[PDB]
Amino acid sequence: QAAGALVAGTSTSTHSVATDSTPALQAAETGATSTARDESMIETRTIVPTHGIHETSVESFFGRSSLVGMPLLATGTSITHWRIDFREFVQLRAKMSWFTYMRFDVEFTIIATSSTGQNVTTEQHTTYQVMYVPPGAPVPSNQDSFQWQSGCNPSVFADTDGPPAQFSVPFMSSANAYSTVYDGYARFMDTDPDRYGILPSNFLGFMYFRTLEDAAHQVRFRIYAKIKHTSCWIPRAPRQAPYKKRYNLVFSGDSDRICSNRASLTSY
């Protein structure tokens, strides 16, 4: 697979003195973007295309790991979980805001770190279990619970102090692509605001964590997600206001402006 597509070039131009051909004159009402090229506006020289465009490709744009979850396992219970979304942290969420529909695979990498009550690093070696709990499967209640047998649910076991755990996931939606946005309701005969903009087809379940023996120290799980094998459809005006909640788009919007203000439009 080769990534050698180039940007466009420039060819030489000369003076125009035409009473018919006028490319400088547009009509934006049509909804069409300007048709004018450098060559038709100034006398231009020749420039051979030498610049690549791979770093702006949909694959390269999303193809790197980002923090998406960060559950904390307490010593008293020795068990936490994480609802599988990409809505908890802003950086990735805002990257996805550029598109309406996205179909892709995911590569998860999990890094475990032990700490003290005062949140300072400590040495702790145990084995933890990450179990995928899909909708309908029974949830574990304790570090002891029988649900950890993992007869059908898939599980990953790794050491607290060993290399990060890592695995890939296919495109799982019941739909044909995930939706970053949804102008509709989650249920029929229900019109509750908490159910507006919620598309259940994007929620594949939870990830449950536990240590194989009662935990001596804290243990925090950092879950990283790499979007790969990406297909995107219908670009959107990206998010400009900050995110306040995880499941909706509400914003503060105090001052109705995005860029900086200045004294005059005629001076900097």
Binding site: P23, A24, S40, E43
Partner: protein
Amino acid sequence: EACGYSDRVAQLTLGNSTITTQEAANICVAYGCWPAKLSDTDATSVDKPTEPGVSADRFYTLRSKPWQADSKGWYWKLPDALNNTGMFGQNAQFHYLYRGGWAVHVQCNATKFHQGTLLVLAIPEHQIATQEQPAFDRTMPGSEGGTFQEPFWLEDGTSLGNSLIYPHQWINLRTNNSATLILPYVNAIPMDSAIRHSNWTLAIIPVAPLKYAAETTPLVPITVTIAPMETEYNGLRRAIASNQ
């Protein structure tokens, strides 16, 4: 058998400047000649010439003038008006000789509620004279240009009425927004000093005064944009900016 449709819109691009107009009256090419460089047989000065190209062969816009009720007319001598502006001016100063054509775009917009008619003329060797022989400030007014004192006589003892024998266009407000003239170099010798001789004179004279559908009327300016064409310079030395 027809006289106005797609000839109303125009775009001229020279160097890094482009002009557009949505209400033109076609383009006038003086004497049907397009600017051109000096022939090996017509030439005389032996030194290899300087051909600046894009740095000088482009559009320059001068300060606008307000069209008032008592306005008699305005004029600019060429190359005089541009001798001290941009890269064209620099080349004209540094050389003893110069040769070149022009692309002139006079613009004046109003509204469908105004009426007025300007005569735009390109006069070759417009040697002027009034009741007395003119002073330097009148003969070579620079970029600010001059004003007609006796427009009926065209400041030369001839006549405004017969001036249509010179390359020209009209800016009649009910019809057009501007005028465009392309002028070739004219002289009785191959080249000449840019600071001692004015080859062409751009003249703008109100023939039908500006009237409006009210007594007030907003400021209605006249703007002149000019571009040197197919230029060549000989006799390089220090820069000399005026004949004073």
